[PDB]
Design a protein around this ligand. Structure first.
Ligand code: 4VF
Length: 330
């Protein structure tokens, strides 16, 4: 049988993988579910076509190298990689992953979560994040659609395309000026689990800052005592005073312990923001916290070359090399 086509994208993954169905997409690719006739289960297949852009080639190599090294229950892995037999023919790379049922984005569109579920989901996000940060890696795009879920409420973090050694979930430092950006994102996700709506839904950069200030209040002098973009600093100083809104006013029915943790994750100053181990140890997560059952990385991850300097043609070679061991006859 020929290759299958899904929403205009051809998927050349047969004969092992067939009966394909759309399940997601990104800047330079598409994800489908597919039947694996070897393991006799359905899998996820992520198609990416990065080779025309140096940045996308960088991201592709990082994502593959990081996910091939990582091993953790709350982190998506790589089971297989398909690409053409020669580098001149390789225009696409197919990354095969465990198939999950849904994501937190879809869940929050349709279901009201109980405190217990919120607690358990938050715990697994942070358990996975502890492993990532222990490897000295930042995810940088945590958000509900990148948190995958099973029938049995198991949670896995996916999409490590932006990982290194989305506006609504973007930490203020990023816009004004480290691991703390991931904590901010988790805080945004916690808030969204509590209310089923994004806490800071800005329409653009300035609007994002305005929503954050609308809740946290005007930043203090120490909050601004840092290296900071001149334009952003002048903008913030041009604004009238904004009062802080108490968390319990915004989330009237929330567990007070959840709101205490939320306060510490959504702290404006990254240096005062709670870190992942301290968050796991917060009273809100007491029911699930189990440091004897929370694996960390054996060593910190680092790249041998640095890829930012490499031409995209050289990056392609490295990707071709990295993926070779999944080829038949290897
Ligand atoms: O990497 C992923 C990804 C993998 C999965 C995945 C993996 C395993 N299972 C399920 N099940 C699904 C079943 C239906 O409900 C949703 C969960 N989904 C979902 N996404 C979200 C999009 N991306 C990123 C962009 O963030 C991406 C994708 C393609 C190209 C690029 Cl450049 C980037």
């Amino acid at each position: 049988a020929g290759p299958e086509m899904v929403r205009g994208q051809v998927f050349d993954v047969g004969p092992r993988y067939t009966n394909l169905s759309y399940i997601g997409e990104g800047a330079y690719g598409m994800v489908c579910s597919a039947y694996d006739n070897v393991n006799k289960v359905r899998v996820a297949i992520k198609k990416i076509s990065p080779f025309e852009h140096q940045t996308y080639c960088q991201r592709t190599l990082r994502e593959i190298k990081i996910l091939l090294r990582f091993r953790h229950e709350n982190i998506i892995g790589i089971n297989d990689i398909i690409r053409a037999p020669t580098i001149e023919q390789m225009k696409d790379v197919y990354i095969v992953q465990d198939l999950m049922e849904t994501d937190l984005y879809k869940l929050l569109k349709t279901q009201h979560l109980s405190n217990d579920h919120i607690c358990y989901f938050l715990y697994q996000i942070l358990r996975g994040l502890k492993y990532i940060h222990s490897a000295n890696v930042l995810h940088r795009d945590l958000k509900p659609s990148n948190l995958l879920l099973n029938t049995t409420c198991d949670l896995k973090i996916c999409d490590f395309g932006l990982a290194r050694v989305t506006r609504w979930y973007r930490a203020p430092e990023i816009m004004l000026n480290t691991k703390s950006i991931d904590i901010w994102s988790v805080g945004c996700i916690l808030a969204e689990m509590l209310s089923n709506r994004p806490i800071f839904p800005g329409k653009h950069y300035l609007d994002q800052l305005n929503h954050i200030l609308g809740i946290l209040g005007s930043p203090s002098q120490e909050d601004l005592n840092c290296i900071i973009n001149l334009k952003a600093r002048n903008y913030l100083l041009s604004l009238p005073h904004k009062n802080k809104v108490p968390w319990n006013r915004l989330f009237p029915n929330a567990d007070s312990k959840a709101l205490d943790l939320l306060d510490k994750m959504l702290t404006f100053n990254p240096h005062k923001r709670i870190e992942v181990e301290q968050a796991l140890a917060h009273p809100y997560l007491e029911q699930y916290y189990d440091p004897s059952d929370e694996p960390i990385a054996e060593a910190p991850f680092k790249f041998d070359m640095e890829l930012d300097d490499l031409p995209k043609e050289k990056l392609k070679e490295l990707i071709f090399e990295e993926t070779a061991r999944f080829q038949p006859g290897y």
